Amino acid sequence: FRRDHTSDQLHAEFDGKENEELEALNIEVAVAGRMMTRRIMGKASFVTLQDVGGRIQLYVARDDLPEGVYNEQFKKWDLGDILGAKGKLFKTKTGELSIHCTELRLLTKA
């Protein structure tokens, strides 16, 4: 449960089946590491983070409880210090690959 955590087998699968399903099996991949690229609109944002050697894009959506634990917590993450976060994988362009950030589990210092 790291950045764009796990799930390879996944990808093999996600790439070709139904939602319902995708869900049943669903992965809540993450974002660990650190960044700052948001597209705010007050609350629920779309974000982009970095990890060891590259980035992933997510969806920080607090559709129901329009928090700060969110993109703001994110606003707070830095350098050495690291994230452990999660979002499900969902239909961005083809039906796979982006994270739908819902739980942000921040760190300790590295």
From Swiss-Prot:
Coiled coil: none
Source organism superkingdom: Bacteria
Compartments, as annotated in UniProt: Cytoplasm
Further information: There are two lysyl-tRNA ligases in E.coli: lysS is expressed constitutively, while lysU is heat inducible.
Similarity remark: Belongs to the class-II aminoacyl-tRNA synthetase family.
Subunit structure of this chain's protein: Homodimer.
Protein name: Lysine--tRNA ligase
Species per Swiss-Prot/TrEMBL record: Escherichia coli (strain K12)
Shown part of the complete sequence: 40 to 149 of 505
